[PDB]
Amino acid sequence: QSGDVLSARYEIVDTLGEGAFGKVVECIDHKAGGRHVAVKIVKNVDRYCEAARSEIQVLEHLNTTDPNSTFRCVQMLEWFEHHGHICIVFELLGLSTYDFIKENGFLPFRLDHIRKMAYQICKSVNFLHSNKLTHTDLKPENILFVQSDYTEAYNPKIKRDERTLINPDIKVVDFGSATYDDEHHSTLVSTRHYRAPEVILALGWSQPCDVWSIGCILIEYYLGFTVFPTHDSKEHLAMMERILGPLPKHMIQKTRKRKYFHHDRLDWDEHSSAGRYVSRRCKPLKEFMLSQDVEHERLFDLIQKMLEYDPAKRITLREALKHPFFDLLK
Numbered sequence: 045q046s047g048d049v050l051s052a053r054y055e056i057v058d059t060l061g062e063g064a065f066g067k068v069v070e071c072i073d074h075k076a077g078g079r080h081v082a083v084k085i086v087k088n089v090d091r092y093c094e095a096a097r098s099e100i101q102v103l104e105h106l107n108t109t110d111p112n113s114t115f116r117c118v119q120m121l122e123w124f125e126h127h128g129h130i131c132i133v134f135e136l137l138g139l140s141t142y143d144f145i146k147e148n149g150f151l152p153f154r155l156d157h158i159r160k161m162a163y164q165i166c167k168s169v170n171f172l173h174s175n176k177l178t179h180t181d182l183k184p185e186n187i188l189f190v191q192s193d194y195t196e197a198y199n200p201k202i203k204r205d206e207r208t209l210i211n212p213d214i215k216v217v218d219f220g221s222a223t224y225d226d227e228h229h230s231t232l233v234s235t236r237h238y239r240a241p242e243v244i245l246a247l248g249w250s251q252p253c254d255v256w257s258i259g260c261i262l263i264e265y266y267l268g269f270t271v272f273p274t275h276d277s278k279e280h281l282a283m284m285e286r287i288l289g290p291l292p293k294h295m296i297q298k299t300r301k302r303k304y305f306h307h308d309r310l311d312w313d314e315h316s317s318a319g320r321y322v323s324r325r326c327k328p329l330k331e332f333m334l335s336q337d338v339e340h341e342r343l344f345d346l347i348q349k350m351l352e353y354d355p356a357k358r359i360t361l362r363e364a365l366k367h368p369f370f371d372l373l374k
C-alpha cells in the first residue's frame with residue numbers, strides 16, 4: 045500500500061510495524077509542510093474495528109487529562125475512516141525498544157539507560173493505573189523511543205561496535221487492549237512471555253498484571269533475551285517455578301486449569317526432554333545477575349517484587365516509583 049493516500053493528505057511512505065490489528069505506517073502530511081506522522085491503519089474486521097474505537101476513546105481521555113504527554117503515552121493527533129479501515133494518526137516516534145535491541149545484535153541496554161527507561165515506563169503505566177485503566181499488553185514492542193538516534197563506539201570487552209542512544213526517552217503505545225476497571229475483562233491478555241500467572245491460571249486480573257509484564261520487560265532489557273523461551277502454558281509455569289520457586293498453594297487450589305496440576309503440584313517431569321530444556325535455560329532469578337554491585341542488586345530486588353506470584357502481594361507501580369533503584373535519577 046506504499047503510495048496510497050488517506051483522507052486526501054497522508055501519503056504512505058513506509059511500514060513501521062505490523063500486528064494482529066493491521067499496520068502502522070509512516071506518512072507524509074501534504075497539508076502540513078511535508079513533515080512526517082505515524083498512522084495506524086486497522087483491518088476492516090469487527091474485533092479490530094471495536095478495539096480501535098476503544099483505543100480512540102482511551103486516547104481522547106488521556107490526551108484531555110495530559111495534553112503534553114507528561115506521562116509519556118503516545119499522542120493521537122486525529123482519527124478518521126478510509127475504505128472502512130479506522131485510521132489513527134500519531135506523532136512519529138522512533139524504533140521500538142525491541143527493534144533497537146534487535147538491530148544492536150541483542151546486546152542488552154546499559155544499566156543507566158535501563159534505569160531511565162524503567163522509570164518512564166512505570167510513570168506512564170502508573171498514570172493509566174491512576175485512571176482506572178490496565179494496559180494488558182505491555183512488551184518491548186509497545187515501548188518506543190522518542191528519537192532512536194545513536195552514537196557508536198568500539199567496546200573492547202565484546203570486541204565489536206555498539207550503539208548508544210543519544211536520548212533514551214520512551215513512550216508507551218497500543219491502547220487497543222486497554223481495559224477500564226468497570227468494563228469486561230478478557231479471559232486471556234498479554235503476549236505470552238509477558239503474561240502474569242493469574243492470567244495463565246484464569247484467576248481474574250487487574251492492574252497488577254501490568255506490573256508482572258514490566259518485570260519481564262526489565263529482565264529482557266538487562267539480559268537481551270527472555271527468561272521464558274516458551275510457547276506452552278504448562279512449560280511456562282515450570283519455567284516460573286525454576287526461576288521464582290513454587291507457585292503458591294492458594295493459587296493452585298483456586299484455578300480450574302487442572303490439566304496443569306497433579307495432586308496440588310505442577311504436573312511436571314523434570315527428567316523429560318522438556319524438563320531438561322527448562323533445567324538448561326532457566327535458573328533462580330538472582331543467578332542471572334551480571335554483577336553483584338549494589339545497583340544491580342536493587343534492580344533485581346525490584347524485579348523480584350514485580351514478579352511476585354500473588355497479584356495482591358505484588359509491588360504497585362506507585363510503590364515502584366519510590367524504589368531505591370531509582371535514586372540516581374534524582
Ligand SMILES: Cn1cc(-c2ccnc(N)n2)c2ccccc21
Pocket residue numbers: 060061068082084118134135136137138140188217218219
Ligand atoms: C512503530 N509503531 C507502532 C506504533 C503503535 C503500535 C500499536 N499501537 C499504537 N498505538 N502504536 C506506533 C506508533 C507511533 C509510531 C510508531 C509506531
